[PDB]
Amino acid sequence: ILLETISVPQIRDVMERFSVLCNSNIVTNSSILLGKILPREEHDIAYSKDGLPNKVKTEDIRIRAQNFKSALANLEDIIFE
Amino acid sequence: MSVQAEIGILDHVDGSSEFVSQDTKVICSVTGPIEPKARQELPTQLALEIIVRPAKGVATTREKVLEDKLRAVLTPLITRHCYPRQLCQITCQILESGEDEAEFSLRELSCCINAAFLALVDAGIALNSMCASIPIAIIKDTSDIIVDPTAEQLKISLSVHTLALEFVNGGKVVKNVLLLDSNGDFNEDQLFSLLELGEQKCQELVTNIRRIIQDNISPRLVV
Amino acid sequence: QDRRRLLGPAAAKPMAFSNSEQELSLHTGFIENCNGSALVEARSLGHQTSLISAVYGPRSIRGSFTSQGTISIQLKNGLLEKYNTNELKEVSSFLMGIFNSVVNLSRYPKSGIDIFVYLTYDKDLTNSQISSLIPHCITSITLALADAGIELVDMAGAGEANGTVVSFIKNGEEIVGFWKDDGDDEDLLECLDRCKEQYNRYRDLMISCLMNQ
Amino acid sequence: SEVITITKRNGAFQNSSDSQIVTPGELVTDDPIWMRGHGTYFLDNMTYSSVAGTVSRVNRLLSVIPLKGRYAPETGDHVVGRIAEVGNKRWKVDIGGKQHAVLMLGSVNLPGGILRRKSESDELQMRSFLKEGDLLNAEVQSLFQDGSASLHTRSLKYGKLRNGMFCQVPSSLIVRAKNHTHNLPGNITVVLGVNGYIWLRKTSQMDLARDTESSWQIYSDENDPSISNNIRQAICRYANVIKALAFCEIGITQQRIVSAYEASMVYSNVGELIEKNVMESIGSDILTAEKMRGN
Amino acid sequence: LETIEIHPITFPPEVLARISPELSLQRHLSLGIRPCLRKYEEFRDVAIENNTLSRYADAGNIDTKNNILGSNVLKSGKTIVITSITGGIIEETEDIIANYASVYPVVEVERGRVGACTDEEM
Amino acid sequence: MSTFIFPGDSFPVDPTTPVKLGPGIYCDPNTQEIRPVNTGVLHVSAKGKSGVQTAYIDYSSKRYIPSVNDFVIGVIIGTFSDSYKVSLQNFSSSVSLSYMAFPNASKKNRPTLQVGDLVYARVCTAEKELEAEIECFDSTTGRDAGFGILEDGMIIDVNLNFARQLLFNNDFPLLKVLAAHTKFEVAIGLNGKIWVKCEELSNTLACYRTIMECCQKNDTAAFKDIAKRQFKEILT
Amino acid sequence: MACNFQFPEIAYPGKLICPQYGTENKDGEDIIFNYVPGPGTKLIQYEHNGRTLEAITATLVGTVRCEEEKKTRRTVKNILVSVLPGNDFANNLPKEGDIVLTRVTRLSLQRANVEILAVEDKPAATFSVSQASSDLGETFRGIIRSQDVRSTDRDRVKVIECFKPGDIVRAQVLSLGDGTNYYLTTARNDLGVVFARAANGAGGLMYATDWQMMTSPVTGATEKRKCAKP
C-alpha cells in the first residue's frame, strides 16, 4: 500500500492497533570484582610545597573546560599583518 | 677514549661505517633517501627504518629496545623535512659485544649511536648537527665514575649510563642531551658529576670523530 | 624460546597444586580507547564471571565495496580460566550470527564494526563450561554496541539452561540463536521457558543500565 | 533411494579426415614453409606441439587445437557475464576466460537514453547502473593484445538480466550461431552465452517482438512482481535438462533443450532429473532420436 | 604601506585536537592548562586494588582452581592496568647484578587490533 | 688539505650579503637561520657575480635526488596511460616521462620505447613532495637535444661526485685516456650512471673495467696507467 | 518541530515510537501525518491479534525528535521521526553531499589523497570527529581529483600549487566511491585549504590572506594554495 490509497478510517485503525500493541508490551548492580575500580571517573591531584597531594575538584575541571572553549571560540581576536 | 672507526666499507649501501671501542665492534649501514612502504610513509617527514642485530643468536626484544633508544637519538639529528614521503634504512650489526650481554647492553648501544651517526655522514643525509655517545659506569666500593668502562668493570658496577649529546659550532656547544639512559642505584649529586665529566669526554669524542670524518671523506672530494 | 616475548627459562615447569538465581553488575562506557565498551559481572553458586566487551567501529575497510557493514567478533582468554582457541572461535561464530540479525548493517556502508570480548576473570569455585558464559557475552556486546551508538533492531539477550543456550529478541517472540551441548532428551520446551526468563531479566537490567547510568 | 541416492565403492580411490592426436614435445612436421600457429613451437625446420590436442591445418597455418582450455573470447560473441569489480570509468566483468573482460562507461546505454544529456557525475555514480554481482548480456566488441575482451551493451538486446535464474555449462557445449536468445514453450526465454554462461528467464515483451519510461528502469534489481509458479517450475525443469545435456557432453542447442524439456515430462517430480541414470537416459534418448530422424 | 587584517578560522577543542595536536597543546598552555584539562604540574590520581584476583585473596576461603600468586588492578585517570603474577619451579645446578633475579612480564595493550606483538608491548 | 665543514657549524657568510643557497646549505623555515646540514668542502662564489653569491657544500654521496635541469640516465620500467614509469636509481622513487615529452609528439602516436630501454633525459620538474618528471626533448624548440634511447652498450654505476666531475670538469683525464685507447661514445648522468658503447664488445668491456677501477681509486694521476693495464689484459 | 503527545520521550533500541501514518481533526478538516523513518529509527513489521502492523521503532538509545519536511482534495504533512543519543562519528558517517575536514597525506600529478578527520553537521557550525587512528590507517581515506579542485579552469590545474602534505582541507563528498577512497571536491568558495603551516609543518602558522595565497604574520613568507574564501 501507499499514501493517498489509505483513508482516514484506515489510519485511525492503525493508530488503534498500535495503541493496543504498545500497551501490551508493558535490585541494584552492586560491584562483584571490577565494578568499583574500572568505571571510576578521572581524578587529578596537585602536590603542594609540603609534598602532600591535593585533590583537584571535578567542577573546577569542568569550569576549566568551558572557560577554554569560550576563550578559543569568541576570544579568537583579529590577526593584523 | 681510544676509539677507532672506518668509513665507507660497504659497496651496496648508500653509506656505512665500522665503530670500535675496546672490544665492542659494531658495523652500520645506511640507505636513503629511498622509496618507502605504504605503512612507513610519512606525508611531510622522512621515515626511519632502524634495525639492530645482536652478536650472538637472533634479534629478540632486547634489540627492540636498542632500536628504540637509537631512534630517540637519530630522529632529531636528521633534517627529516627535507625528505617527505621517503625512507631511510638504518641497520646495525653488532659484531662483538665487548660486555656480558646477559647483564649489560651499555657499550653496544653507545657504539651503535656513534656508528649510525658515522654511517649517516657517509651517506650524505641532511643532519641538523653532530653527535657523540659514551658509556659510563659507577663502581661498587670506590664509587668512582669511570668513562668507557671495561667488561670487568661493569661486573662490579652499581649503575650503568649511556650519554649521547648533540653538538654544534665546531663541536664546542652542547645543543641538547639526545639520550641519557641511567640504570641502577644513584643519587642527584652523582648524576650531575656524571653529566659534567660525561660532557667533557663526549666533546673529546666529537673532536676525534670530526678528525676521522675529514680524514676519510676529503680524499673523495676535489679541491 | 620466543623472540617476541619473555617466557623465562625453558627448564622451568609450571606450578601444579595438590589436593537469588543470579547476581549481576553492569557498567558501560569506561574505555576511551574505543567507541563502545561494557563491563558484565555475574555471581552465582560456585562460579563467578567478569568479562569486558569493546566495540571498535565503524572504521575503514579498504577492500572492494559493500552496501552494508561487516561485523567481526573475537573472544580472548583472560587471566584465570583458559579455553580452547577452537571453542572461542566457535562461540565467536555463534555470536556473529546473532548480531548479524540485530545490527542495522544498512546504515554503515564500506565500514567495519570489530567487537572484542575479553573473558578477563572467570573463576570456577566448584572446589564445556563455555555454555554458561555465552548469555553474558551477548549482554556485554549488546551493551557495548548500544553504548557505541550502533543501531540495533532490538535489545538482544539470552539465557542458559542445562547446556542449552538460546538468544531472544522481540519480547521473546522470536529466536536469534540456538545453542545446545550435552543436556538431556526432549527438554527443549523447558529450556526455552527458563532461558526466556533469564532473557527478560537481562533485558530489563540492560535497559535500566543504558538509561539511568 | 527414497531420500538420498548414495553410490558406494570399496578398495579404490575412484572408479577405474582422421584427427591426429599429439602430445607436448611431439614432432608434428619438418616442413619450414609452414606458418606456426597456436599450440605449437618451432626450431628451424622442426615444428613441435606445446599442448595435447589435434593437429589443425588451415591453408599454410599449422596449429594444434587443445583438447581442453578456458573459453577464448572472439570478436562479436554473445556472452553472459557477472560484474566482478567497478573502477574509474569502466567495469570488469567475469565471463569465464583467463582474464576479466572490460566494459567501458562509454560502451553502455545510460538510462533515459538518447534524450539524456551528458553528465560528469555518471563516472562517479557507476554503481547505480552496474554493481558487483550483477548479470548482463554483452557483445565482445573488440580484443586486446593478449586476447582479453572489451565488451559493449549498446543495444536493447543487451543489458542487465532479471526475472530468472542462472546456470552454467562448459563453453565447449555451446557454439556460435546467428542468435543465442531463444523462446521456448512454457513462456520462458533462454540466453545461451557462447562462454557457457546461461540465463533462463520469464519471456518478456522484447522476447516476443524479436520474432514478431522503460529506458529508466533498465538497471533495476527489481523483478517482475507477477511471476507464476508454472513459469518458475518451468525454469527449474529447463535448468535440470540443460545440466543433463551437459552431463552427457551433449552440445546445447535450442532444439535439444525443448526436445529434452518435453521428453523429461515422463517424470512427474522435477527433482527426479538430478539423478545420474535419468540424466544419462535423457541425453541418450536425444541422440537416438536424432539418429532415426536424420537417416 | 600594505596593512591587511585576517580573520583566524576557529575550531571546537575536540576538532582542533584532531586537526592539529601541536596547536591544541599550545592554545591550552597559553591559558596555564593542558589538553587533558590539567595544570602544568598536576598528576593523575591513582586507585588500586591488590590481591583481588589472587588465590590467596580470602585467607579463610583459598581458591583451589587458581594459580595467581598476586595481582593488582590499577586505574590512573582514564587508563586501566591489570597485573597478575603466576609462578613456576626450576631445578638449579655482594650487591653485584649477578645475584639478582627478575620477573618475566608479558604486557598487552588492547587497542582493538589483532596480530603479532607491537613494538610498544615488546 | 681542504676547508671542511660539519653540520651545526656556524655559517661563515654574513646575512648582510645576498646569498643563493645550493646543495648542503639549509634555511630553517622556523628560525630563518642559514645553517649547513651536510659534511664536506664549502664553496663560495666570488663577488661581482651579478651581485649574487652562490654558496654550497660539496659532499660525498651516491643516492641521487632529482633536481631541475639535470641530465640523467633512466631505464623504462613501466607504461602508464599518458607517461612512462622510469627508474633513475634502484630502490629510489620512480620518475615520470610523458608521451608528449618527445620530439614530433602527438596524441595519436605514442613513442616506441619499450620497458627495459635506457633513456638519456633532462629533469624538468623536481618537486620535493611530488613525483619528479623528466623529458626527452627541448621544451621550446621541440627538437631532441641529444636526448632519447641509448641503444645497446653497457651502463656503469658510479658515485654522484665522480659523475659530476665527469660531466662538468674538463680537466678530468678519464675521457682523454680512454680516447687514447679506442673510439667510444658516452652518455653521462648526474644520477650516477655512465653509458659506454664501442664497435666491439672487448673495447666496451675494457672501458667498463677502467671506469670502475678509476671510480674506486679516485686518484687522478693514475688513470692512464689503469687504462694501460686494462686494454693490455684484454689482448691476452 | 514538535511531536504529538502520544509519542514516547526517551527511547531504547527496540522501543515502539509511532505508526507509519497519523491523523487529526483541526478546523473541520482532517490533517494527514506521514511519518518517515529517520536516523535512529526503522520501519518494522510486527504481528498482533492476527493482523500485521508496521510501526516506527527506535534503533538507538536517546531522545525522540520530529520535524516537518517537504521537497477531490487532500492535505498531507510529512513528519521525520528520528532518535538522537542523549563526538560520535558513527551515526554521522560521510555521505554524498556532506562537507568534511580532511588532511592531505600524499600528492600526485593528477590527484590528492586525503584522510577524513571530521564531518560537518547541519545546524558556529558543529562537527563530528572521527575517533579512529591515523597511525594505523583506521581513518576513511579520500581522493580529490585535479578537476575537482576548483570551479574555473579545471583542465589546467597544478596539484603542487593547490595543496601540500599535511594541509587541512575542507571538502565536500561527491560519492562513496569504493571501499578504499571517498571522492571529494573543493570547487566552492568555502572549500579548500583551511589550516596549514609553512614548509609542510616545519614553519610557522599561515593564514588565508588571499583565496589563492597563504601568508605568515611572523615571517612574511607566503605560499600558493587553494584556500577557502576568508
Added chain:
Amino acid sequence: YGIVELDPECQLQNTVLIADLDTEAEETSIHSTISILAAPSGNYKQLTLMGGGAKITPEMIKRSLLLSRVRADDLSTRFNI
C-alpha cells in the same frame, strides 16, 4: 615529564615543565621528555633523558627529580601495601 617551548603566535586572551604526560596531543608534540624511577628513600633507580625538542636544562632535571620524589612518596604510602 615533558618540556615545551611556549609559541608566541599561539597565545589567547621560555620553557615549561609538564608532569605525567597524557592525551595524544602531548605524546605526539612533546619531544623533550624525562622518565624517572624514584625510590622513597631518596635515591633513583632509573633516569631517562630524551631531548629532541626544547633544550633539557639542569633546572628542568632538578625540578623533575624533585617531583619524582614527591610522587614516589605519595604512591608508596597511599595504599598501605
